[PDB]
């Protein structure tokens, strides 16, 4: 899993991490976690209360790598939503939303498009702020979107 990380990233993380190895050695306490990440360049907020009483170095390398992955695919889905934002005002009408989902990619079906709508912030004129939708879900493009929404729907119903 650290295999996903570059040798420079691994040194970067060794250093940062060891700087807060003010001992009990090989471990940092979870309180210093916020700080370590910032002494890099992350500014997390509560995605950081979710992140996991001390973290050892392999699991820090792990969280870090899992986070690169957590952000790349975030970008990938915002990318997809951009492809479909006619003018780029950061918005997509529910109608445009319904049209591409059902018409491109692994075509969803209208019953499974309605629930891709209810959850999202209210009908801002029929418009949809898709960023408040990427932050919720956490051609080929519709497929990246469609695949993710499914993953989001898998998560919600995994409760019951």
PDB file of C-alpha atoms in Angstrom:
ATOM      1  CA  UNK A   1       0.000   0.000   0.000  1.00  0.00           C
ATOM      2  CA  UNK A   2       2.998   2.277   0.589  1.00  0.00           C
ATOM      3  CA  UNK A   3       3.911   1.014  -2.924  1.00  0.00           C
ATOM      4  CA  UNK A   4       1.497   3.663  -4.196  1.00  0.00           C
ATOM      5  CA  UNK A   5       3.841   6.339  -2.728  1.00  0.00           C
ATOM      6  CA  UNK A   6       6.926   7.833  -4.301  1.00  0.00           C
ATOM      7  CA  UNK A   7      10.367   7.481  -2.683  1.00  0.00           C
ATOM      8  CA  UNK A   8      10.403  11.223  -2.083  1.00  0.00           C
ATOM      9  CA  UNK A   9       6.971  11.163  -0.463  1.00  0.00           C
ATOM     10  CA  UNK A  10       8.206   8.341   1.748  1.00  0.00           C
ATOM     11  CA  UNK A  11      11.167  10.474   2.869  1.00  0.00           C
ATOM     12  CA  UNK A  12       8.909  13.507   3.273  1.00  0.00           C
ATOM     13  CA  UNK A  13       6.579  11.459   5.474  1.00  0.00           C
ATOM     14  CA  UNK A  14       9.432   9.809   7.409  1.00  0.00           C
ATOM     15  CA  UNK A  15      10.783  13.258   8.335  1.00  0.00           C
ATOM     16  CA  UNK A  16       7.449  14.961   9.154  1.00  0.00           C
ATOM     17  CA  UNK A  17       6.416  11.962  11.147  1.00  0.00           C
ATOM     18  CA  UNK A  18       9.655  11.551  13.005  1.00  0.00           C
ATOM     19  CA  UNK A  19       9.625  15.294  13.902  1.00  0.00           C
ATOM     20  CA  UNK A  20       6.599  14.492  16.140  1.00  0.00           C
ATOM     21  CA  UNK A  21       8.140  11.241  17.375  1.00  0.00           C
ATOM     22  CA  UNK A  22       8.908  13.075  20.598  1.00  0.00           C
ATOM     23  CA  UNK A  23       9.016   9.386  21.567  1.00  0.00           C
ATOM     24  CA  UNK A  24       7.285   6.226  22.861  1.00  0.00           C
ATOM     25  CA  UNK A  25       9.261   5.642  19.764  1.00  0.00           C
ATOM     26  CA  UNK A  26       7.947   4.684  16.354  1.00  0.00           C
ATOM     27  CA  UNK A  27       4.609   6.242  17.309  1.00  0.00           C
ATOM     28  CA  UNK A  28       2.944   9.655  17.331  1.00  0.00           C
ATOM     29  CA  UNK A  29      -0.140  10.291  19.438  1.00  0.00           C
ATOM     30  CA  UNK A  30      -3.413  10.988  17.636  1.00  0.00           C
ATOM     31  CA  UNK A  31      -3.577  14.553  18.998  1.00  0.00           C
ATOM     32  CA  UNK A  32      -0.447  15.494  17.027  1.00  0.00           C
ATOM     33  CA  UNK A  33      -2.037  14.056  13.918  1.00  0.00           C
ATOM     34  CA  UNK A  34      -3.714  17.285  12.890  1.00  0.00           C
ATOM     35  CA  UNK A  35      -0.360  19.071  13.129  1.00  0.00           C
ATOM     36  CA  UNK A  36       1.736  16.525  11.249  1.00  0.00           C
ATOM     37  CA  UNK A  37      -0.546  16.777   8.232  1.00  0.00           C
ATOM     38  CA  UNK A  38      -0.382  20.584   8.242  1.00  0.00           C
ATOM     39  CA  UNK A  39       3.385  20.597   8.586  1.00  0.00           C
ATOM     40  CA  UNK A  40       3.011  18.930   5.221  1.00  0.00           C
ATOM     41  CA  UNK A  41       0.387  20.948   3.342  1.00  0.00           C
ATOM     42  CA  UNK A  42      -2.902  19.288   4.145  1.00  0.00           C
ATOM     43  CA  UNK A  43      -5.465  21.337   5.983  1.00  0.00           C
ATOM     44  CA  UNK A  44      -8.019  18.695   6.954  1.00  0.00           C
ATOM     45  CA  UNK A  45     -11.122  19.348   9.100  1.00  0.00           C
ATOM     46  CA  UNK A  46     -13.068  16.350  10.562  1.00  0.00           C
ATOM     47  CA  UNK A  47     -12.309  14.189   7.505  1.00  0.00           C
ATOM     48  CA  UNK A  48      -9.540  14.039  10.075  1.00  0.00           C
ATOM     49  CA  UNK A  49     -11.742  12.940  12.985  1.00  0.00           C
ATOM     50  CA  UNK A  50     -12.774  10.148  10.622  1.00  0.00           C
ATOM     51  CA  UNK A  51      -9.107   9.348   9.644  1.00  0.00           C
ATOM     52  CA  UNK A  52      -8.988   6.615  12.390  1.00  0.00           C
ATOM     53  CA  UNK A  53      -4.415   5.893  21.190  1.00  0.00           C
ATOM     54  CA  UNK A  54      -1.424   6.379  18.831  1.00  0.00           C
ATOM     55  CA  UNK A  55      -0.613   5.968  15.111  1.00  0.00           C
ATOM     56  CA  UNK A  56       2.488   3.990  14.154  1.00  0.00           C
ATOM     57  CA  UNK A  57       4.483   4.640  11.020  1.00  0.00           C
ATOM     58  CA  UNK A  58       3.162   2.008   8.632  1.00  0.00           C
ATOM     59  CA  UNK A  59      -0.398   3.075   9.370  1.00  0.00           C
ATOM     60  CA  UNK A  60       0.459   6.735   8.953  1.00  0.00           C
ATOM     61  CA  UNK A  61       2.003   5.846   5.555  1.00  0.00           C
ATOM     62  CA  UNK A  62      -1.253   4.005   4.960  1.00  0.00           C
ATOM     63  CA  UNK A  63      -3.610   6.871   5.880  1.00  0.00           C
ATOM     64  CA  UNK A  64      -1.518   9.235   3.762  1.00  0.00           C
ATOM     65  CA  UNK A  65      -1.649   6.937   0.677  1.00  0.00           C
ATOM     66  CA  UNK A  66      -5.349   6.276   1.128  1.00  0.00           C
ATOM     67  CA  UNK A  67      -5.811  10.039   1.260  1.00  0.00           C
ATOM     68  CA  UNK A  68      -3.974  10.642  -2.093  1.00  0.00           C
ATOM     69  CA  UNK A  69      -6.444   8.113  -3.475  1.00  0.00           C
ATOM     70  CA  UNK A  70      -9.285   9.847  -1.609  1.00  0.00           C
ATOM     71  CA  UNK A  71      -8.465  13.105  -3.357  1.00  0.00           C
ATOM     72  CA  UNK A  72      -7.586  11.912  -6.882  1.00  0.00           C
ATOM     73  CA  UNK A  73     -11.027  10.325  -7.320  1.00  0.00           C
ATOM     74  CA  UNK A  74     -12.650  13.365  -5.746  1.00  0.00           C
ATOM     75  CA  UNK A  75     -11.016  15.355  -8.566  1.00  0.00           C
ATOM     76  CA  UNK A  76     -12.132  12.709 -11.061  1.00  0.00           C
ATOM     77  CA  UNK A  77     -15.794  13.116 -10.166  1.00  0.00           C
ATOM     78  CA  UNK A  78     -15.638  16.922 -10.139  1.00  0.00           C
ATOM     79  CA  UNK A  79     -14.015  16.549 -13.562  1.00  0.00           C
ATOM     80  CA  UNK A  80     -16.960  14.477 -14.758  1.00  0.00           C
ATOM     81  CA  UNK A  81     -19.477  17.012 -13.402  1.00  0.00           C
ATOM     82  CA  UNK A  82     -17.576  19.777 -15.208  1.00  0.00           C
ATOM     83  CA  UNK A  83     -17.833  18.034 -18.550  1.00  0.00           C
ATOM     84  CA  UNK A  84     -21.577  18.485 -18.272  1.00  0.00           C
ATOM     85  CA  UNK A  85     -21.752  22.068 -16.903  1.00  0.00           C
ATOM     86  CA  UNK A  86     -22.768  23.883 -20.080  1.00  0.00           C
ATOM     87  CA  UNK A  87     -21.439  27.291 -19.013  1.00  0.00           C
ATOM     88  CA  UNK A  88     -19.356  26.337 -15.970  1.00  0.00           C
ATOM     89  CA  UNK A  89     -21.339  28.383 -13.441  1.00  0.00           C
ATOM     90  CA  UNK A  90     -20.809  25.461 -11.035  1.00  0.00           C
ATOM     91  CA  UNK A  91     -24.348  24.315 -11.570  1.00  0.00           C
ATOM     92  CA  UNK A  92     -26.346  21.644 -13.452  1.00  0.00           C
ATOM     93  CA  UNK A  93     -30.113  21.753 -13.818  1.00  0.00           C
ATOM     94  CA  UNK A  94     -31.938  18.693 -12.528  1.00  0.00           C
ATOM     95  CA  UNK A  95     -33.192  18.158 -16.081  1.00  0.00           C
ATOM     96  CA  UNK A  96     -29.724  18.155 -17.552  1.00  0.00           C
ATOM     97  CA  UNK A  97     -28.819  15.934 -14.616  1.00  0.00           C
ATOM     98  CA  UNK A  98     -31.602  13.497 -15.440  1.00  0.00           C
ATOM     99  CA  UNK A  99     -30.878  13.600 -19.163  1.00  0.00           C
ATOM    100  CA  UNK A 100     -27.212  12.577 -19.217  1.00  0.00           C
ATOM    101  CA  UNK A 101     -27.462   9.934 -16.485  1.00  0.00           C
ATOM    102  CA  UNK A 102     -30.218   8.123 -18.340  1.00  0.00           C
ATOM    103  CA  UNK A 103     -28.712   8.770 -21.758  1.00  0.00           C
ATOM    104  CA  UNK A 104     -24.994   8.255 -21.393  1.00  0.00           C
ATOM    105  CA  UNK A 105     -22.824   5.583 -19.731  1.00  0.00           C
ATOM    106  CA  UNK A 106     -24.216   2.656 -17.780  1.00  0.00           C
ATOM    107  CA  UNK A 107     -27.605   4.275 -18.235  1.00  0.00           C
ATOM    108  CA  UNK A 108     -29.296   4.588 -14.879  1.00  0.00           C
ATOM    109  CA  UNK A 109     -33.104   4.419 -14.952  1.00  0.00           C
ATOM    110  CA  UNK A 110     -35.531   7.219 -13.981  1.00  0.00           C
ATOM    111  CA  UNK A 111     -36.542   5.595 -10.648  1.00  0.00           C
ATOM    112  CA  UNK A 112     -32.810   5.473  -9.865  1.00  0.00           C
ATOM    113  CA  UNK A 113     -32.366   9.106 -10.984  1.00  0.00           C
ATOM    114  CA  UNK A 114     -34.947  10.561  -8.573  1.00  0.00           C
ATOM    115  CA  UNK A 115     -32.959   9.526  -5.507  1.00  0.00           C
ATOM    116  CA  UNK A 116     -29.884  11.111  -7.201  1.00  0.00           C
ATOM    117  CA  UNK A 117     -31.810  14.331  -6.752  1.00  0.00           C
ATOM    118  CA  UNK A 118     -33.798  14.270  -3.450  1.00  0.00           C
ATOM    119  CA  UNK A 119     -30.662  14.106  -1.279  1.00  0.00           C
ATOM    120  CA  UNK A 120     -28.955  17.151  -2.915  1.00  0.00           C
ATOM    121  CA  UNK A 121     -29.446  20.740  -1.660  1.00  0.00           C
ATOM    122  CA  UNK A 122     -32.859  22.208  -2.565  1.00  0.00           C
ATOM    123  CA  UNK A 123     -34.125  23.135  -6.114  1.00  0.00           C
ATOM    124  CA  UNK A 124     -32.074  26.346  -6.538  1.00  0.00           C
ATOM    125  CA  UNK A 125     -34.509  27.208  -9.407  1.00  0.00           C
ATOM    126  CA  UNK A 126     -34.280  23.609 -10.684  1.00  0.00           C
ATOM    127  CA  UNK A 127     -30.491  24.071 -10.678  1.00  0.00           C
ATOM    128  CA  UNK A 128     -28.091  21.779  -8.701  1.00  0.00           C
ATOM    129  CA  UNK A 129     -24.787  22.853  -7.036  1.00  0.00           C
ATOM    130  CA  UNK A 130     -22.837  19.768  -7.954  1.00  0.00           C
ATOM    131  CA  UNK A 131     -20.000  20.579  -5.526  1.00  0.00           C
ATOM    132  CA  UNK A 132     -22.461  20.073  -2.651  1.00  0.00           C
ATOM    133  CA  UNK A 133     -22.905  16.700  -4.397  1.00  0.00           C
ATOM    134  CA  UNK A 134     -19.262  15.697  -4.702  1.00  0.00           C
ATOM    135  CA  UNK A 135     -18.935  16.500  -0.966  1.00  0.00           C
ATOM    136  CA  UNK A 136     -21.976  14.248  -0.436  1.00  0.00           C
ATOM    137  CA  UNK A 137     -20.649  11.291  -2.473  1.00  0.00           C
ATOM    138  CA  UNK A 138     -17.626  11.163  -0.105  1.00  0.00           C
ATOM    139  CA  UNK A 139     -19.997   9.374 -22.013  1.00  0.00           C
ATOM    140  CA  UNK A 140     -17.197   7.915 -19.909  1.00  0.00           C
ATOM    141  CA  UNK A 141     -17.876  10.901 -17.617  1.00  0.00           C
ATOM    142  CA  UNK A 142     -21.495   9.995 -16.909  1.00  0.00           C
ATOM    143  CA  UNK A 143     -20.034   6.558 -16.099  1.00  0.00           C
ATOM    144  CA  UNK A 144     -17.572   7.976 -13.527  1.00  0.00           C
ATOM    145  CA  UNK A 145     -20.534   9.861 -12.085  1.00  0.00           C
ATOM    146  CA  UNK A 146     -22.915   6.884 -12.275  1.00  0.00           C
ATOM    147  CA  UNK A 147     -20.410   4.455 -10.733  1.00  0.00           C
ATOM    148  CA  UNK A 148     -19.794   6.840  -7.806  1.00  0.00           C
ATOM    149  CA  UNK A 149     -23.435   7.504  -7.109  1.00  0.00           C
ATOM    150  CA  UNK A 150     -23.947   3.746  -6.886  1.00  0.00           C
ATOM    151  CA  UNK A 151     -21.105   3.566  -4.350  1.00  0.00           C
ATOM    152  CA  UNK A 152     -22.847   6.331  -2.408  1.00  0.00           C
ATOM    153  CA  UNK A 153     -26.120   4.396  -2.519  1.00  0.00           C
ATOM    154  CA  UNK A 154     -24.330   1.233  -1.440  1.00  0.00           C
ATOM    155  CA  UNK A 155     -23.049   3.126   1.636  1.00  0.00           C
ATOM    156  CA  UNK A 156     -26.355   4.718   2.765  1.00  0.00           C
ATOM    157  CA  UNK A 157     -28.316   1.449   2.692  1.00  0.00           C
ATOM    158  CA  UNK A 158     -25.493  -0.582   4.267  1.00  0.00           C
ATOM    159  CA  UNK A 159     -26.766   0.848   7.535  1.00  0.00           C
ATOM    160  CA  UNK A 160     -29.911  -1.368   7.542  1.00  0.00           C
TER     161      UNK A 160
END
